[PDB]
Design a protein around this ligand. Structure first.
Ligand SMILES: CC(=O)N[C@H]1[C@@H](OP(=O)(O)OP(=O)(O)OC[C@H]2O[C@@H](n3ccc(=O)[nH]c3=O)[C@H](O)[C@@H]2O)O[C@H](CO)[C@H](O)[C@@H]1O
Ligand SMILES: CC(=O)N[C@H]1[C@@H](OP(=O)(O)OP(=O)(O)OC[C@H]2O[C@@H](n3ccc(=O)[nH]c3=O)[C@H](O)[C@@H]2O)O[C@H](CO)[C@H](O)[C@@H]1O
Ligand SMILES: O=C[C@H](O)[C@@H](O)[C@H](O)[C@H](O)COP(=O)(O)O
Ligand SMILES: O=C[C@H](O)[C@@H](O)[C@H](O)[C@H](O)COP(=O)(O)O
Ligand SMILES: N[C@@H](CCC(=O)O)C(=O)O
Ligand SMILES: [Mg+2]
Ligand SMILES: [Mg+2]
Lengths: 655, 660
């Protein structure tokens, strides 16, 4: 779910310029939740914008943001020509994990049939049931089934029982959050406080952007406790704020945000931002990083840009002249990491596959036990963790709920915690003792592509550090590093087969299932490949450990069942050939992903995807890219959108 | 694939009785699958059995043992009434690997057109190419495309080039195995050694049963290297020996067996059994607690159905003598001399393949809880590929119903080389994994004759839980938890009967999925293994694409498969993950999914809001996995029966037949 609001203080904007800014802001956040959307602005059609702040209008509709963008326009009541010198508008896109994605369950929620208080919420209230019964007894009627409505009906209860006639909007919100349990990122708007916005958070992101041609009064807003305190233009009033749950919706307008913190109750009053209970900083992000460029989809871009993101992951960290690896984020801890006795990799989904993909080389080069855990199961079992465990947390977004709770679980037990993240300032990167930012750039597509290969590369670089003092492993280190030097170009070679992959997708788009088989370094490849095909093509694809065929799953193979096998020139080659012979003996007709030089396999197999050879512990990067491409093409053939798969969105930050 | 030889020494038997005993032996080995069978015996119709010892007759045929039995009695020139005071008959069921199924490629393989030597073989001779080239150059013509025939021709080569006229049958076979490469179990017979048998093995099971109304000379056969030294009846000669590759072919005659080991050469000479070796070590004569009834279908139409519905009994047999509900104590006799060391180790590693691996996943959480040690569960094939680090203070468990799975066995030797304490959780006495582990527990579920693991899974489950209960029997703070679990085991057999009484409800579900091509089985926590195991059963038995999905992973991708057309089975039990399982259910339903829910009888909320629910009784949280997987065992069974499949037919065949 995404949050976005636009507050133009003494910056005249027509009602069309404001609505096109709220929609354009949700488009930047649509990848976090596209089951429904809504906006909240001021109604009425009075030339004097002052006589319109008392009327709130809510336009909410089911579907992606494009369904709402059309619902806003072509209306017979809203005149899109009114000039507003001061106006506040809030928007929201929702990931409806429960119930129906109806307009009533979408945000903003309202407190009454006259819209005196409207709020947009990201997160969950763990006690909204108790709050709902208390509010129903005092005379408040509920309409929606969401936990967000208990926040709108409650901020009005704190307003109907205030002590003074002019209690600040902050005091009302402060009394609400004290009754709310769980996490939340709220943005309020009320007719009683025209133009005044309030943004409080607790375990959920929420920043405030600012733009103004004038000089700002400070760059370090001092947090307060219940002229030289608020952020505002000095001489004039022309200022534009941008509340948002992510920086992508604000970079297009400005690169000056104020990241809030837990329980920081920000408030814009008279166009002055003040925090209650900061640092006005610049964003290290360019707009081109969140643009599709000349690609028809973000996922396609992010796949074909893996030659570059692999390079950025190694930038300033790998020196091929002298074969040295330095991860700055682990300089002050690499010594203590080496005195520990076990590695534990904890993550969900594709990030968990990255740990599977690198488990073997980590075991080889560190010689420590390595355990790879799915976060949700790690928590269910109350896995034993000890003071001399080193726990890695792989999370592209750095906000995954299960991975984050696993982190706090391990910290409570004294383990050294290491983060492998792609989002600076995220919960997981902050709360870990150390870590590495994989520096892959923003990932917009729901299905992770470059985050997997960048996590892969990052864990390999770590392994290379852990053994840089072993004489016996010096050559092995050079071998791997020479592989990394050649990886970007070998990735380009794999991408050049895009057309050949597309041809093969036309021979499979109609099937209902596909088994992907591999072992060793390519177990993770067949798990991740199966996950991608599931996620965006909706075919029933399943990864099967090749060595496990003889123990049951081989019974499913016949001349009709599609099969993809991965056979690379590493130490499991012969065992992979036996698995291939078993599939053939069952009349299977598999597609084999093999090395170009593997002439024996290429002759005896009709359909082969010939990838270039690399180091065994890097080949997994080259063998998974074809399956990223296959899933992409299969989705296009089946008429699906690769960037917006059904039933979910990107980053699981709630239950 | 199956070996059986019957040696009656001074126990008069007619030719009919001998042949019926060979046929009956192969009938006990058919469940292992085969494409042909054959028998070898003494031909000739001379009323004196002593003159018929130089005429070996072979009857081999492609097809089932039934057809062989018909071919046996369909012999016009054979007199079935001759009485033999001493005789050796050998029999074999073949799973063709080298050479296509045929009479010529069936066993026994002969050494020449006069059948001077014959041999039956389980396995593959890797270097059979070089061996065939050599013997051909020395002037030995082959007639079959089997690797086995090289064994028969080679033993005659050693005989043809013996130094003295009285070199022992053992010596010849010793010189043969020293030239063979690969895996083999063998039984030899020859006109030049009438009444004698030689059996040897390398990488393939071979055992010897013995029966005699007289006192036997010893229960521990010493090894002889290249009276008091061998096994024999004392006061009289009468004795019967049974060579076999599986105890199922011996248990009806005797329960006293000797388990041969790699490169042992066992020989019966003048009715006395000795075990020679080229390398006081000996081989024990032990008593098997196996009964013929345990390998018969009885009133059940299939072994799968029997082994599912008898799980109330097998669970009881797994616990017998090991749990004391009178004072809440657990005693696994097999761990008495090692439990102290195990408690001083620092990590548990469970290593297994397939369903046996699922048993580790199903008991990982309770092992962690009750031992407080790290518990790592590893698929044997991947454990080996990665060269997993193993240390001297690791306790490595090896779960295996058969005790012969190659990868699990190689993982066992991997861990022994690194000094780890090794523990077996097995269901086959005398199997490789039982012998080679430092210690272990025989789960005592009875032989598993069905193709798919049913009672073995639940008995492995119970056995690992019992081990967890031993590991914490000294912790005051855990006494209550141990009592709760042991009262759950006390009630488990009756709870299983309750679940089995819902068979009708499971059939209804089978017809609903009759036409379906896929089904997602979703669960978490204690029931992650239930999903994986249920998905493997339905794949193996029903041949539809069933897949287990960890419920907590739905929102990370796999949930995209849910729509109004995808069948789904969800497991929601009354444990600590109940709320998270409800969340997963709301996620599915929100996307038009209409799942079938396996839940507790008294979960009224889910029963009303879900159309079809399989309602199992509630047990301890760490035991519910046994009750929640049984409806999936039955589901797989009924779907296959509906689709015309033979649940007792393997199908899963290895690589094709090398024709050469
Ligand atoms: C964010 C930042 O200023 N990065 C700078 C840092 O990159 P580096 O490559 O040296 O470090 P990094 O970006 O990987 O990590 C930055 C800091 O965050 C910590 N960390 C990182 C990831 C995680 O999940 N958890 C965690 O605690 C890490 O321990 C370090 O203290 O130095 C570079 C020059 O060499 C550049 O100046 C980079 O801009
Ligand atoms: C096989 C056998 O005759 N067991 C007898 C033994 O059972 P316990 O129930 O006393 O033995 P159970 O078969 O576990 O173990 C028998 C022996 O085999 C060993 N073992 C077992 C399984 C494995 O995978 N690895 C391994 O090393 C185990 O350490 C022990 O030395 O005593 C009983 C009486 O109390 C009965 O007389 C049982 O028949
Ligand atoms: O293609 C699938 C998605 O990428 C998904 O599986 C993702 O990997 C997880 O939701 C974990 O997300 P993070 O890596 O951001 O924590
Ligand atoms: O139904 C499943 C099968 O039984 C199969 O998966 C079996 O579990 C493995 O082949 C391991 O066999 P063992 O338990 O004999 O090692
Ligand atoms: N390799 C031998 C024996 C195989 C077996 O039945 O185990 C053959 O194919 O004849
Ligand atoms: Mg940090
Ligand atoms: Mg043993």
């Amino acid at each position: 779910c995404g949050i976005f609001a636009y507050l133009n203080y003494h910056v005249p904007r027509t009602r069309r310029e404001i609505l096109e800014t709220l929609i354009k802001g949700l488009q930047r956040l649509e990848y976090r939740g596209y089951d429904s959307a809504g906006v909240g602005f001021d109604g009425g059609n009075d030339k004097d914008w002052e006589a319109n702040a008392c009327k709130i209008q809510l336009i909410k509709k089911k579907g992606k943001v494009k369904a709402l963008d059309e619902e806003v326009h072509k209306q017979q009541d809203m005149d899109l020509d009114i000039e507003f010198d001061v106006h506040l508008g809030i928007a929201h896109t929702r990931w409806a994990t429960h119930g129906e994605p109806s307009p009533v369950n979408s945000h903003p929620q309202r407190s009454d049939k006259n819209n005196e208080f409207i709020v947009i919420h990201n997160g969950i209230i763990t006690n909204y049931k108790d709050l709902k019964k208390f509010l129903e007894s005092k005379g408040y009627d509920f309409e929606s089934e969401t936990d967000t409505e208990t926040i709108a009906k409650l901020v009005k209860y704190m307003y109907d029982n205030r002590e003074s006639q002019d209690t600040s909007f902050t005091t009302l919100v402060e009394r609400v959050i004290q009754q709310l349990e769980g996490a939340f990122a709220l943005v309020f708007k009320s007719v009683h406080f025209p133009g005044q916005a309030v943004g409080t958070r607790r375990g959920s992101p929420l920043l405030i952007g600012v733009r103004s041609e004038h000089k700002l009064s400070t760059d370090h807003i001092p947090i307060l406790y219940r002229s030289t305190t608020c952020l505002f233009p000095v001489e004039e009033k022309a200022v534009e704020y941008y509340f948002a749950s992510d920086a992508s919706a604000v970079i297009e307008h400005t690169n000056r945000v104020i990241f809030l913190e837990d329980d920081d109750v920000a408030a814009v009053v008279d166009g002055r931002l003040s925090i209650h209970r900061r640092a006005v900083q610049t964003l290290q992000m360019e707009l081109q990083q969140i643009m599709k460029g000349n690609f028809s989809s973000f996922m396609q871009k992010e796949i074909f840009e893996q030659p570059e993101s692999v390079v950025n992951t190694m930038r300033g960290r790998v020196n091929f002249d002298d074969y040295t690896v330095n991860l700055g984020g682990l300089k002050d801890h690499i010594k203590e990491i080496q005195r520990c006795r076990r590695l534990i990799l904890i993550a969900c989904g594709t990030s968990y596959h990255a740990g599977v993909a690198t488990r073997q080389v980590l075991e080889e080069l560190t010689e420590l036990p390595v355990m790879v855990e799915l976060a949700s199961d790690f928590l269910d079992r109350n896995t034993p963790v000890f003071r001399d465990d080193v726990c890695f947390f792989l999370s592209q977004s750095g906000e995954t709920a299960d991975t984050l709770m696993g982190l706090r679980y391990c910290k409570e037990r004294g383990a050294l915690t290491v983060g492998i993240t792609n989002t600076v300032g995220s919960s997981i990167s902050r709360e870990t003792d150390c870590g590495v930012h994989i520096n892959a750039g923003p990932e917009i597509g729901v299905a992770s592509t470059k985050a997997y290969t960048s996590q892969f590369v990052s864990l390999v670089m770590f392994a290379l550090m852990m053994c840089d003092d072993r004489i016996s492993m010096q050559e092995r280190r050079k071998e791997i590093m020479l592989g990394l030097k050649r990886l970007p170009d070998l990735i380009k070679e794999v991408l050049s087969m895009d057309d050949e992959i597309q041809k093969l997708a036309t021979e499979l788009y109609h099937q209902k299932s596909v088994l992907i088989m591999g072992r060793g370094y390519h177990y993770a490849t067949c798990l991740e490949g199966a996950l991608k095909i599931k996620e965006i093509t909706y075919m029933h694809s399943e990864g099967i450990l090749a060595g496990e065929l003889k123990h049951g799953p081989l019974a499913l193979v016949d001349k009709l069942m599609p099969v993809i096998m991965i056979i690379m020139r590493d130490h499991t080659y012969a065992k992979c050939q036996n698995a291939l012979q078993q599939v053939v003996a069952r009349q299977g007709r598999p597609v084999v992903i093999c090395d170009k030089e593997d002439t024996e396999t290429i002759k005896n197999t009709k359909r082969t995807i010939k990838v270039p050879h690399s180091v065994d512990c890097l080949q997994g990067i080259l063998s998974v890219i074809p399956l990223q491409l296959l899933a992409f093409h299969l989705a296009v053939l089946r008429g699906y959108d690769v960037d917006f798969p059904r039933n979910l969105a990107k980053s699981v930050t709630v239950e």
